[PDB]
């Protein structure tokens, strides 16, 4: 399918690479400050109605990265001293470029990005005495972070676009159409961390207290779901962002 890529161009280093729950939270906040809850409620309705946003991924120059689908971990047998070495380096990879992501979905052979467009530099500081560390994310030249939006343009223009500008005032925003070719399939990857409704096929747990399925997990026809809750009324985003994925039998 085609999607809107929201490119975050960083004006300085970042703390996190935000995932779908944190992105929806931020957007929900900004929209409350711009249009009041009336708008928040219409945002949730649009999302519950089929609109979706991915977690943020790195982009480098004109290269978009996507999460490695957990679909290939058990397929990696698909030189014996090249087989063991390379297979362990795929199993560590968090990201593939678009081209290789599309190949991984079809269980065809693919290759890994050699350098990734961000290093984690966590800086130490002494306190009062002990050492504490603040993880920071440094970006290469013309490198940053993006998320995908699927849904009606009226919901993008009216809620997502304005919210993202407001959120920038640490970054500037620009958006471009993006196509991801994905096989038609019973099965799909989430490009977002999700609160699943069904039990999933393959997954990584992600603890935040909520239990999320990680980006790259595999579900069978699972929309995930949103949660409302009270603590002085906030919505937690856990909807799946599905792309079809070929599974190996086993």
């Amino acid at each position: 399918p085609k999607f809107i890529a929201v490119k975050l161009i960083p004006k300085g280093p970042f703390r996190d690479i935000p995932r779908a729950d944190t992105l929806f939270g931020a957007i929900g906040n900004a929209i409350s400050a711009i249009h009041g809850q009336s708008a928040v409620e219409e945002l949730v309705d649009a999302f519950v109605g089929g609109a979706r946003i991915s977690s943020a991924f790195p982009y480098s120059g004109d290269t978009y990265y996507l999460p490695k689908p957990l679909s290939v971990e058990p397929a990696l047998e698909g030189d014996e001293e090249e087989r063991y070495t390379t297979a362990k380096r795929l199993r560590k990879a968090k990201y593939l470029d678009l081209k290789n992501f599309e190949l991984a979905l079809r269980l065809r052979p693919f290759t890994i990005p050699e350098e990734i467009p961000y290093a984690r530099v966590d800086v130490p500081r002494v306190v009062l005495s002990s050492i504490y560390f603040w993880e920071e994310i440094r970006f290469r030249e013309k490198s940053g972070v993006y998320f995908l939006y699927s849904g009606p343009r009226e919901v993008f223009d009216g809620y997502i676009a304005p919210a993202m500008r407001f959120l920038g005032d640490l970054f500037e925003v620009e958006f471009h159409e993006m196509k991801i070719d994905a096989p038609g399939s019973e099965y799909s990857v989430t490009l977002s961390n999700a609160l699943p409704t069904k039990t999933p096929v393959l997954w990584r747990l992600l603890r935040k207290r909520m239990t999320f399925i990680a980006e790259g997990s595999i579900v069978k026809n699972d929309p995930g779901g949103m949660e409302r809750l009270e603590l002085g009324e906030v919505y937690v985003y856990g909807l799946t962002f599905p792309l079809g994925v070929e599974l190996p039998e086993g």
Partner: protein
């Protein structure tokens, strides 16, 4: 006795003939001569079960056997005749599924070209080193056979009392006396006992069990160990977590054995939170497993959330598949590893409800733990199935199972209580107070700079090497000898033993009597050790050389080293040494990340060093600049700046290894650095100047 205990003990003693023949005692084939040994032993002391067990050495009609069995009146022990025929037949097939002079020693599984001197397994005596092939003297076997006889005379005739003495004495004994025979007798014995008891609980007087999937390979593996242990809020607590994971693991394995009615012989291995068990393939077993798998996970989730998971999987396997044809055992282990990878991508899937620190502070003077019921007085920790009561020196043990630390000798425990020997690398420097040293006291003990030393080491491509094992008994030897290097001999290596084997290693000080070293973990094929940075730097080279000797120089270590401010949190030190171990691995393996280093990002310059390369460099440069024990050489006391200048010069090769200025800036102290070496430029390799910081940075740290 009952068939279950008989068939176990039987499988275990089927091949006790071998040690007696190779001693000059009964003048008969190992089979008949092993019969004479148990019968003779039975008649002495007066324990008739040995004469029942004697029938195993001699076996395939069967006219004589049926009558020989009859003369030994079975009803005496609560046994049928037909019962003993199956026990004998089972153990006969089991011996062939586990699967020439008579002075031939055990050839090393690591290097079949070299062989082990006869010795009894003792972690306090000399390090096992595969050396030149020597025939074993017939006296050495006769000395073995007599302690062997004196031990069985006083043992309780329960597999848990039989296994330890067979392991003390038959560990370094060839199972068959062919050239290049790799299999410990002890391992062949415990695997025949394992396979036999599996066939019994299988429902086999029978080739039905051989060509039908009547066995289960059960593989268990803890997921998130690294997080469970090294992601805290102190060294005491870190060691408590590590020790707690060993008991949680044992509580699961012993459960599986107890509920499937199996013996410790059925444990192929239990190392680094990874276990393998051969068991029966009855529908009563898979249900019994499914219950255990589920209650274990549900307990782990309640106790630590998603932090620590247990992936348990099993596979229907036939007798064919313990063997070779045209390698099916490897093929069967591979299919099972796959199931474990999938199960690890379904963490806590065995919950459906998923999608809707005073007791460890308390955890120096204890002998082991009692596996009692969860609600028992004195329980200090709980696993998913049972409570653990510390068994102290002056005290009495409590429980159905006693776990006993770093002995194969029960000592003073009650006769009813099952003996579980467990080995743990638990070296630590004692403080002024009796307790284990802090990160602070370890760092303070350093030559020069006060930094804590940290090193994570791991064996290269072990999975590949284990994959090349044909048989259960081969894998059992490889697995145990490997696990023992880390659980057994790393303590000795730290103490200062194996001086002649180790040799000259890079070093900054005279080795201490009580080294400022503390072991966090040493098991499987890897270790995490902390201590005074200089003692840690040296221990890396000691452990690599020990390991090179213990393998036949056929297996390799990679090591990640780190030198941190004593105030750095564990999670960060763990992360950095992990990153550096992976780097050593990823840049070729058989290499060590000695120190953090600047380099061209041109993909020609490795951060890691080949062990021999760094050992050469240290032999070349250290003696010219370093006197020892925190002191520069007298020449360089006023000229300490030339060392810093060589580093500033090496930076103008890092800025650009093509800009030829570092020729310009350049002594009779470092001759091989002044030139522009061309073999290097041609071979597409770094200039010698690139490598020297590895030595200088260590020496500048030692002299501050």
């Amino acid at each position: 006795m009952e068939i279950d205990e008989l068939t176990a003990l039987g499988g275990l003693l089927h091949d006790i003939g071998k040690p007696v023949q190779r001693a000059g005692l009964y003048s008969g084939d190992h089979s008949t001569q092993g019969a004479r040994f148990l019968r003779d032993l039975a008649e002495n002391t007066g324990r008739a079960e040995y004469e029942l067990l004697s029938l195993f050495s001699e076996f395939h009609n069967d006219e004589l056997m049926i009558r020989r069995i009859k003369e030994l009146s079975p009803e005496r022990f609560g046994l049928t005749m037909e019962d003993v025929l199956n026990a004998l037949w089972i153990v006969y097939e089991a011996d062939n599924l586990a699967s020439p002079q008579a002075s031939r020693p055990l050839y090393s599984v690591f290097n079949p070209g070299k062989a082990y001197p006869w010795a009894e397994l003792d972690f306090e005596k000399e390090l096992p080193v595969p050396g030149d092939v020597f025939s074993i003297r017939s006296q050495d076997y006769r000395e073995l056979v007599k302690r062997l006889w004196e031990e069985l005379s006083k043992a309780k005739l329960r597999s848990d009392r039989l296994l330890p003495v067979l392991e003390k004495y038959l560990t370094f004994v060839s199972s068959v006396t062919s050239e290049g025979n790799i299999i410990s007798l002890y391992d062949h014995m415990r695997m025949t006992s394992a396979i036999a008891l599996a066939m019994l609980r299988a429902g086999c007087a029978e080739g039905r069990c051989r060509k039908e999937k009547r066995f289960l390979l059960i593989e268990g593996d803890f997921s998130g160990i690294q997080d469970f242990i090294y992601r805290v809020s102190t060294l005491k607590y870190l060691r408590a977590r590590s020790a707690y994971l060993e008991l949680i693991g044992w509580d699961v394995v012993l459960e599986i054995l107890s509920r499937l009615g199996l013996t410790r012989a059925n444990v192929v291995f239990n190392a680094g939170g990874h276990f393998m068990i051969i068991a029966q393939n009855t529908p009563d077993a898979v249900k019994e497993l499914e219950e255990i798998r589920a209650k274990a996970v549900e307990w782990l989730y309640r106790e630590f959330e998603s932090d620590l998971y247990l992936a348990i999987e099993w596979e229907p396997v036939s007798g064919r598949e313990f063997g070779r044809e045209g390698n099916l055992f490897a093929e069967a282990r591979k299919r099972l590893k796959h199931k474990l990878t999938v199960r690890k991508l379904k963490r806590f899937g065995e919950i459906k409800g998923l999608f809707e620190c005073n007791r460890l502070v308390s955890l120096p003077k204890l002998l082991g733990f009692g596996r009692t019921a969860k609600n028992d007085a004195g329980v200090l920790v709980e696993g998913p199935f049972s409570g653990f009561v510390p068994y102290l020196q002056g005290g009495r043990p409590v429980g159905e199972q006693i776990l006993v630390k770093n002995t194969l000798n029960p000592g003073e425990i009650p006769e009813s209580a099952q003996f579980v020997p467990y080995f743990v690398a638990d070296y630590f420097k004692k403080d002024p107070k009796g307790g284990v040293a802090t990160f602070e006291e370890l760092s303070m003990a350093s030559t020069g700079t006060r930094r804590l030393g940290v090193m994570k080491g791991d064996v290269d491509r072990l999975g590949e090497f284990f994959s090349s094992m044909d048989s259960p008994s081969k894998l059992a030897t490889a697995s145990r000898f490997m696990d023992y290097f880390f659980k057994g001999y790393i303590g000795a290596i730290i103490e200062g033993k194996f001086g002649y084997i180790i040799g000259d290693v890079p070093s900054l000080r005279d080795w201490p009597e009580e080294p400022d070293i503390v072991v966090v973990y040493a098991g499987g094929d890897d270790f995490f050790i902390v201590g005074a940075w200089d003692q840690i730097f040296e221990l890396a080279f000691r452990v690599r050389r020990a390991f090179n000797a213990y393998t036949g120089g056929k297996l390799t270590l990679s090591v990640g080293l780190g030198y941190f401010d004593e105030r750095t949190p564990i999670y960060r030190m763990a992360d950095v040494v992990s990153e550096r171990l992976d780097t050593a691995k990823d840049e070729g393996r058989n290499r060590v990340f000695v120190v953090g280093r600047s380099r061209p990002l041109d993909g020609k310059h490795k951060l890691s060093y080949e062990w021999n390369h760094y050992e050469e460099l240290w032999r070349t440069y250290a003696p010219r600049i370093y006197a020892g024990n925190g002191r520069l050489k007298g020449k360089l006391e006023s000229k300490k700046g030339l060392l810093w200048k060589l580093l500033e010069i090496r930076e103008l090769y890092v800025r650009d290894p093509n800009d030829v200025r570092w020729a310009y800036l350049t002594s009779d102290l470092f001759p091989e650095l002044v030139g522009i070496d061309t073999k290097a430029v041609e071979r597409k390799e770094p200039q010698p100047v690139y490598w020297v910081d590895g030595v200088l940075k260590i020496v500048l740290m030692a002299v501050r």
